[PDB]
């Protein structure tokens, strides 16, 4: 405070977190990745390759025309505009997101590229080398190549610079965070796709049956090239007891595993000593030499580089190259296919040889039991592809398709000698349709579920969806490296448990930077180049890796790491760059690629003034941050970037997190060494060598888990249940829900901010958009109607508005051009001249075929009246005349739903055809069967509802809103539920807010002391009286406020019954689903239960009369159903058998008849006979 | 094995 350099406390860190969320936000990774893709990656994709050259040779039959031409097309700078929409009339105007959402447009912006066309001419003189020159016809002229969808709030969106007032004007919720696309009016979010990192050597043991014992592999890939995956594997043949332990490498496009020494000799290292030096860096390590001698013994047959190249070419799978050119083929394999991530040029054989030696070294170290096999689940070995890289690779493929099409068109128009035009060449539909298809559907091509419909049930649900990662498929386990990067307890319970993860609150994903400045820094500061590195003269040299590429060695790694840290801590190096120094392995790794997940941490320095380790951040920085925050709600601004640029906080990912020591809290772990028995037991770690400090432990949780009060007092599965269940909580998802035509919307009448609240939930805006209510809960075995997770809800409380909800549903309908003049028309169908008119009443429709808002609608009533033209002059069906030129295509209300029509919206689609949306509003009032849950995984349905007079009451007349069974508590061990009830009682009495943050020093004893100071029993018990008789209950009841969510699972949306209804057209069985009035599945194991019961006739009735009973005729000669049965004429005849008096009828399921007919169609005769030919 | 996890064998 008064002292500027005083150390900070645990309370001060929340100021730092506030600054972080003031600069980053909650969906910063999405926007950052997209901005990186738009600003830089599009230009790189355009410039790389995309130079179409077509050399039209002279083909001179006569020397008069011995001129060869060469047409080249190049792409210059790319311009991406603000989002705009075309129109049926051709007028183009600015498009805003809350117009694309309503009109089912795509929030996309056009792309233009400066295309330069050049032509060269040369004299086709045989023998003489051709020399091409300009003809001075340099034409260049931007062209429209497609449209890129733009995510909201990105740098190229209209809302990026919008203020709060502007957002209100544009019908946009200020709480909306962006980070999603609008494809055809639907909000789509790109789930972060997890993958294994590239250019990292991983060594794995193999099982006993396999001949290879250990395999070292690298998934080599280059970012600035073809972006192709080539997998190099180095395998150690022979088990432990085997003698012939030869190491072999699996080169691409080679049918066999070449021995390693052959590869070394091919690269240009002939002597055995030099090869072993390249492989083994220690002369004294005779074990590795002994293990490696079989390789040189195997390769002794080849003693020359050309011989090795010929050997590789002979093993080459092409088998279409002459003997002397096999050398060239092998050279190409070793240049453009072997370790592409190192280089694609020539003259770098030594670097690739060194890398191969390093891989073999790692393999031999793992085989010698000197290091464990690499863990596949280490989160530092994983990368998350965000919207940026995904769109980048998709656009790369799509633009390659477009440029191949351009080249094909140019070839076609030059071979046919037609004129050349740019507009006829480019096909923007390619890029536009490809991007729209990849984003509209889950699939990512031409993987699945990459893009998903954004969840808008609740604000926290939307936030969790926007920070979701999926792993394509023990990988399901919660790894140690997941600390502080993904939520420890937030994952689906089903098949995706552990595979689907959620980012922690402060976790970010790197967007990738150019490693050239770092390489220049390394070269300047004294990094030895790898070309002239001799391991013998520099034994204790630290290998320096940049993005998995071994760039050289350094002899003083300590000073190099210190200066790299200083540069990154002053901003000269991008803070996303991760630098790891492994002292034991003598390695230095620098990673700058995208997809790395990191988190911020406080920096701890020596602090010689105090004589002990201390945080770099002091009270002065906290005061400046507080001043900036107060000014935002005139001095110099102090933001999170200010802390970053002055070396106060650092970005650490899992790889760098391996080589640091972190203090959990500053106030207890930094200073060197009568305790409260109520406080939990903590240790000081008895060690003072910390390098970093956690900003706050509660930041390891995700968005959904940050809502849980006292999550550290709960059993972990309960926290997981609440994390999965708060996304289904009902509240206010956005403030502008009144101007959005969403398919389904649920809103609480009276959302209440929790009495027990966490510090992390005011960055999630939970107090502004709550999704629950504070209900007075009593834990009591009152009437027996709350057993087995049932609950008793107060009917009087429901009558006054507790948990009441609004429900909106929207129906969309378009008119489509079936032809040139076959346009549909929205109108009120008339029974005189319309076909297939539904049984619902059309009365509520007025002239334009749309119910005006305010009209009550019940189930099956028609709300949108649409008709389509058909071919006239047809007579059938009994009441079909030439007047019936219109077929009804109306949209009725849901059969099980009803309400008041709220709003209807008419507009024009992209094609210019009128289409409408009808939003209908109803009110959901809690009833028996609705599902409610606390914030601790205590789900349950309403068993019964009692009025106020019947509920138990305290001496003050307070009656509970809810009664829950005690038996739900002991087995589930949800102590946090009880603690939060007590804290909420104290907070309601005292008027303060209960601080239910996880790892604070808030104990039950202190809360009880406050409650006793308020005049109540310290443990929350209250003397209650029975409602029916007024007599005191012998047992005192745990009583107090508790926060409950109303879940989306209401009984009225699940009740379903079917006596008889529509049948499937193929199998003649009941249809599937309650939305189609379907039937319940009587599955196999229900049939097994009925067999066990011994009820044969009930089983037959279920399988025949209840589902499908079909009478079919057969003959006694052949058991086939090929019997022609004219029932009215009473004539039965099986052609072929030529019988008419030997026919039977049988009752079999129609599915059985279909199976027999399909077997007959498959050349099998299932002859059915009605008598036994053999004795039992 | 199995399948999954023919046989072995077949």
């Amino acid at each position: 405070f008064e002292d500027e350099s005083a150390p900070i406390t645990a309370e001060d860190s929340w100021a730092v977190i506030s600054a972080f969320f003031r600069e980053k936000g909650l969906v910063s990774q999405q926007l950052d990745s997209f901005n990186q893709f738009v600003d830089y990656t599009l230009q790189d994709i355009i410039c790389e390759d995309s130079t179409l050259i077509l050399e039209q040779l002279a083909q001179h039959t006569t020397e008069s025309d011995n001129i060869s031409r060469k047409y080249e097309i190049s792409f210059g700078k790319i311009y991406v505009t603000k989002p705009m929409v075309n129109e049926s009339d051709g007028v183009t105007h600015a498009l805003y997101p809350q117009e694309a959402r309503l009109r089912n447009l795509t929030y996309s912006s056009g792309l233009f590229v400066d295309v330069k066309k050049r032509t060269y001419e040369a004299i086709d003189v045989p023998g003489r080398e051709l020399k091409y020159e300009l003809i001075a016809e340099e034409s260049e002229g931007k062209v429209f190549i497609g449209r890129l969808p733009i995510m909201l709030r990105s740098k190229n969106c209209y809302l990026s610079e919008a203020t709060e007032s502007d957002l209100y004007k544009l019908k946009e919720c200020p709480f909306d965070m962006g980070g999603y696309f609008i494809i055809n009016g639907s909000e789509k979010v790109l789930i972060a796709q997890e993958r294994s990192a590239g250019n990292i050597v991983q060594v794995f043991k193999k099982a006993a049956p396999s001949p290879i014992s250990h395999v070292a592999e690298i998934r080599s890939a280059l970012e600035k090239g073809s972006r192709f995956i080539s997998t190099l594997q180095v395998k150690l043949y022979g088990r432990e007891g085997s003698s012939a332990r030869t190491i072999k490498a699996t080169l691409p496009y080679i049918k066999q595993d070449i021995p390693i020494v052959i590869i070394f000799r091919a690269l240009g290292i002939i002597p055995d000593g030099e090869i072993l030096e390249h492989i083994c860096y220690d002369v004294n390590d005779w074990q590795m030499l002994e293990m490696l001698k079989p390789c040189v013994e195997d390769g002794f047959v080849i003693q020359d580089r050309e011989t090795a190249l010929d050997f590789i070419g002979r093993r080459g799978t092409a088998l279409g190259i002459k003997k002397e050119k096999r050398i060239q083929y092998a050279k190409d394999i070793l240049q453009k296919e072997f370790l592409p991530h190192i280089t694609q040029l020539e003259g770098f054989e030594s670097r690739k040889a060194f890398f191969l030696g390093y891989m073999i070294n790692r393999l031999l170290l793992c085989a010698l039991d000197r290091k464990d096999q690499d863990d596949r689940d280490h989160f530092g070995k994983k990368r998350l592809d965000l919207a940026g890289p995904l769109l980048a690779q998709l656009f790369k493929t799509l633009f390659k398709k477009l440029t191949k099409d351009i080249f094909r068109y140019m070839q076609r128009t030059v071979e046919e000698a037609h004129d050349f035009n740019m507009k006829l060449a480019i096909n923007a539909k390619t890029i536009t349709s490809g991007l729209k298809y990849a984003l509209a559907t889950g699939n990512w091509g031409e993987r699945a579920g990459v893009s998903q419909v954004l969840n808008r049930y609740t604000y926290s649900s939307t936030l969790s969806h926007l920070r979701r990662t999926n792993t394509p498929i023990k990988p399901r386990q919660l790894h140690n490296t997941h600390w502080g990067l993904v939520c420890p307890a937030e994952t689906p319970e089903g098949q995706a448990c552990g595979l689907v993860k959620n980012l922690s609150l402060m976790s970010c994903i790197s967007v990738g930077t150019d490693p050239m400045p770092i390489i220049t820094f390394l070269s300047e500061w004294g990094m030895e180049p790898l070309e002239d590195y001799v391991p013998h003269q520099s034994p204790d040299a630290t290998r320096v890796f940049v993005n998995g590429v071994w760039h050289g060695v350094h002899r003083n790694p300590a000073r190099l790491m210190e200066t790299l840290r200083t540069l990154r801590r002053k901003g000269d190096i991008n803070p996303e760059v991760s630098m790891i120094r492994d002292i034991r392995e003598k390695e230095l790794k620098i990673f700058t690629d995208a997809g790395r997940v990191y988190r911020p941490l406080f920096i701890v320095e020596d602090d010689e003034s105090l004589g002990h380790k201390e945080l770099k951040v002091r009270k002065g920085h906290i005061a400046k941050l507080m001043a900036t925050e107060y000014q935002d709600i005139d001095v110099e601004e102090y933001t999170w970037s200010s802390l970053l640029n002055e070396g106060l906080v650092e970005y650490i990912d899992a790889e760098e997190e391996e080589s640091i020591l972190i203090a959990m809290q500053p106030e207890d772990l930094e200073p060197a060494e009568d305790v409260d028995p109520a406080k939990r037991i903590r240790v000081s770690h008895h060690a003072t060598t910390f390098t970093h400090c956690e900003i706050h432990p509660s930041m390891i949780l995700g968005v959904a888990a940050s809502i849980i009060p006292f999550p550290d007092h709960n059993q972990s599965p309960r926290n997981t249940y609440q994390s999965a269940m708060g996304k289904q909580a009902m509240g206010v998802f956005l403030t502008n829900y009144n101007v959005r035509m969403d398919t389904m919307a649920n809103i609480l009448y009276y959302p209440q901010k929790p009495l027990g609240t966490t510090r992390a939930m005011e960055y999630l805006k939970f107090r502004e958009l709550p999704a629950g209510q504070n209900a007075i809960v009593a834990i009591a075995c009152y009437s027996g109607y709350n057993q087995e997770d049932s609950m008793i809800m107060n009917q009087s409380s429901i009558d006054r508005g507790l948990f009441r909800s609004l429900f909106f549903r929207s129906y969309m309908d378009q008119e489509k051009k079936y032809g040139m003049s076959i346009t549909e028309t929205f109108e009120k169908p008339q029974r005189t001249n319309t076909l297939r008119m539904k049984h619902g009443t059309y009365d509520k429709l007025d002239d334009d075929g749309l119910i005006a808002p305010g009209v009550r609608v019940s189930g099956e009533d028609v709300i949108i009246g649409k008709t389509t033209p058909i071919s006239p002059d047809e007579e059938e069906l009994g009441q079909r005349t030439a007047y019936h030129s219109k077929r009804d295509a109306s949209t009725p209300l849901r059969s099980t739903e009803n309400g008041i029509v709220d709003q209807v919206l008419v507009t024009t689609n992209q094609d210019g055809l009128k289409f409408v949306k009808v939003r209908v509003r109803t009110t959901k009032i809690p009833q028996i069967g609705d599902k409610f849950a606390s914030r601790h995984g205590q789900k349950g349905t309403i068993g019964i509802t009692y009025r106020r007079e019947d509920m138990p009451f305290t001496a003050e007349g307070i009656v509970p809103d809810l009664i829950i069974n005690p038996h739900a508590i002991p087995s589930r061990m949800t102590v946090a539920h009880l603690i939060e009830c007590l804290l909420s009682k104290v907070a309601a009495l005292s008027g303060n807010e209960g601080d239910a943050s996880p790892f604070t020093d808030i104990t039950v004893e202190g809360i009880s002391k406050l409650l006793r100071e308020h005049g109540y029993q310290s443990r929350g018990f209250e003397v209650m009286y029975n409602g029916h008789t007024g007599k005191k209950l012998m047992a005192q009841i745990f009583f107090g406020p508790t926060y409950y969510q109303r879940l989306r699972h209401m009984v009225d949306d699940k009740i379903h019954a079917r006596a008889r209804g529509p049948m499937q057209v193929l199998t003649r069985q009941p249809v599937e689903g309650r939305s189609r009035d379907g039937g319940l599945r009587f599955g196999e194991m229900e049939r097994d239960c009925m067999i066990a019961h011994g009820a044969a006739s009930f089983l037959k009735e279920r399988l025949m009369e209840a589902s499908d009973a079909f009478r079919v005729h057969i003959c006694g000669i052949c058991g086939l159903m090929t019997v022609i049965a004219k029932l009215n004429h009473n004539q039965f005849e099986c052609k072929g058998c030529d019988n008419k008096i030997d026919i039977y009828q049988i009752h079999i399921p129609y599915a059985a008849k279909l199976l027999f007919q399909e077997l007959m169609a498959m050349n099998i005769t299932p002859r059915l006979y009605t008598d036994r030919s053999r004795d039992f | 094995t199995x399948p999954g996890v023919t046989x072995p064998g077949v």
Binding site: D272, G273, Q287, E290, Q303, D369, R370, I583, R584, T689 | -
Partner: protein, 116 residues
């Protein structure tokens, strides 16, 4: 074993029988470089490997912050502070004996008792 290489073409040298002197003779397989043998040992196979447990020790191993510190007696400096770590041999049957490196003398001493 201490394998040695030819000094003419930098290639391996293999053991070879001799008749005139009945002695071990190391010979080159490509240039016929021939010389005497330093030791009769030509192949060592460590079924139980004792070395490699202290591997990874570096002249600045104390700079690692993750390595735990201790005040155990250093029997070359009598200094308290030092770093300690368990055996680096990753075999499943290795013992949990600790190794200590003094940060003022870089002398590695163990906590074993059978050896002492």
């Amino acid at each position: 074993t201490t394998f040695r290489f030819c000094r003419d073409c930098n290639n391996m040298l293999y053991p070879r029988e001799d008749k005139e002197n009945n002695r071990l003779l190391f010979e080159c397989r490509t240039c016929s470089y021939v010389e005497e043998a330093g030791s009769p040992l030509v192949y060592r196979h460590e079924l139980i490997t004792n070395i490699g447990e202290t591997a990874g020790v570096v002249q600045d191993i104390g700079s690692d912050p993750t390595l735990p510190r201790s005040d155990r007696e250093c029997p070359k400096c009598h200094s308290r502070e030092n770093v300690f770590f368990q055996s680096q041999q990753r075999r499943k049957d290795t013992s949990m004996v600790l190794f200590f490196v003094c940060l003022s003398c870089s002398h590695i001493f163990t906590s074993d008792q059978k050896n002492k």
